[PDB]
Amino acid sequence: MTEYKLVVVGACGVGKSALTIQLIQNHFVDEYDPTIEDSYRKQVVIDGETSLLDILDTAGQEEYSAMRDQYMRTGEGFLLVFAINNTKSFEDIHHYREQIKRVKDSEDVPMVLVGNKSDLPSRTVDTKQAQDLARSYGIPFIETSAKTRQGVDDAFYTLVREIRKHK
Amino acid sequence: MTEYKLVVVGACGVGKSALTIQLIQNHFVDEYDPTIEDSYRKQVVIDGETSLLDILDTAGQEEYSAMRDQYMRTGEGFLLVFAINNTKSFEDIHHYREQIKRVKDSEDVPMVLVGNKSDLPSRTVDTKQAQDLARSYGIPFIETSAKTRQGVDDAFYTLVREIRKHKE
């Protein structure tokens, strides 16, 4: 079977750990240590074909890091996560994508834009704004709630579809 | 001196001809025949360095065209023009950029996003939308009015700056 390395990226507190732990362990973590950076395995069937996912939930400081470059180099697909009630996290998506482009020396890297915390009544990032960003990047956009599990599987499955299309 | 092939692209009626004729001949044309596709030569000085510009003002049908592909292949920089009172023309920018990238093997092609008709108060494309689009594409955004000549020189000069950056 095929194996894929996925990387979950995004600003502090957008829900990267919560999304990943929901996918892997099927519960919502409300206080996950923000310094834990780890990877998780899961075997999944997507569109009838099994794949082994290795998912890195990233955590670090705002700084250049050779180790982070190595994570980007080995990563085959990236979830670009922002929170719908945090405009800064949406604006910074652009910078995170530029870092991936720099390391991988490529603009065609598999990526999915993820707008998390969709269960919250309020939002500061418009859906159209996010759809338009994803359109400009040529990538899918998925709305999620790690809290209710809405769209969690879809976000990761869609990323795998993107990696498969790229290969 | 260096010589660059520039190509002006954009939807029907966004002001490609009006912009180009303003740059070349310094007057505003109201009813320019929409079937005329032609090139103009112009020596310009930009940041103290002279370049010869060969500028193609495009016109054609909404159809695949081998000839248009050849224009894209030889073109070195592209003005992506929309009109600020025409939302469809702004949405269509994306498709025009995709065609240029298809033909040019996904090169990081020099391009400038141009929001024309900025003199009009009938705006439907928000300025922020356009800045955000240009940011995503990694290109400059210039607002222009072929009618008042606002930004016309700047749009073309900025494209030449982008070409010079790329060829370095």
Ligand SMILES: Nc1nc2c(ncn2[C@@H]2O[C@H](COP(=O)(O)OP(=O)(O)O)[C@@H](O)[C@H]2O)c(=O)[nH]1
């Ligand atoms: N309301 C809501 N809160 C969320 C959601 N996902 C994460 N959170 C909260 O946001 C905080 C940060 O989440 P975490 O996964 O640790 O963020 P990380 O820093 O990106 O790894 C946590 O306390 C979560 O409870 C969501 O979908 N909805």
Ligand SMILES: Nc1nc2c(ncn2[C@@H]2O[C@H](COP(=O)(O)OP(=O)(O)O)[C@@H](O)[C@H]2O)c(=O)[nH]1
């Ligand atoms: N108000 C205004 N009208 C413009 C401007 N630029 C072009 N036009 C008008 O828009 C129409 C189409 O312009 P044209 O240059 O022929 O567009 P093209 O089809 O893209 O070559 C004409 O009536 C022009 O006079 C502008 O900056 N302001």
Ligand SMILES: *SCCNC(=O)C1CCN(C(=O)COc2ccc(Cl)cc2Cl)CC1
């Ligand atoms: S919640 C406290 C921890 N803060 C962070 O983890 C932040 C560090 C900066 N940052 C990024 O660099 C996001 O971009 C990437 C991260 C990892 C990888 Cl492999 C690639 C990219 Cl582009 C935001 C989170």
Ligand SMILES: *SCCNC(=O)C1CCN(C(=O)COc2ccc(Cl)cc2Cl)CC1
């Ligand atoms: S105003 C009546 C004439 N209509 C047109 O000229 C339209 C034809 C379709 N179209 C485009 O294809 C714009 O995109 C390009 C045109 C030329 C070149 Cl070399 C490259 C591109 Cl991407 C809009 C104008």
Ligand SMILES: [Ca+2]
């Ligand atoms: Ca975390």
Ligand SMILES: [Ca+2]
């Ligand atoms: Ca794509």
Ligand SMILES: [Ca+2]
């Ligand atoms: Ca014309």
Ligand SMILES: [Ca+2]
């Ligand atoms: Ca650029």
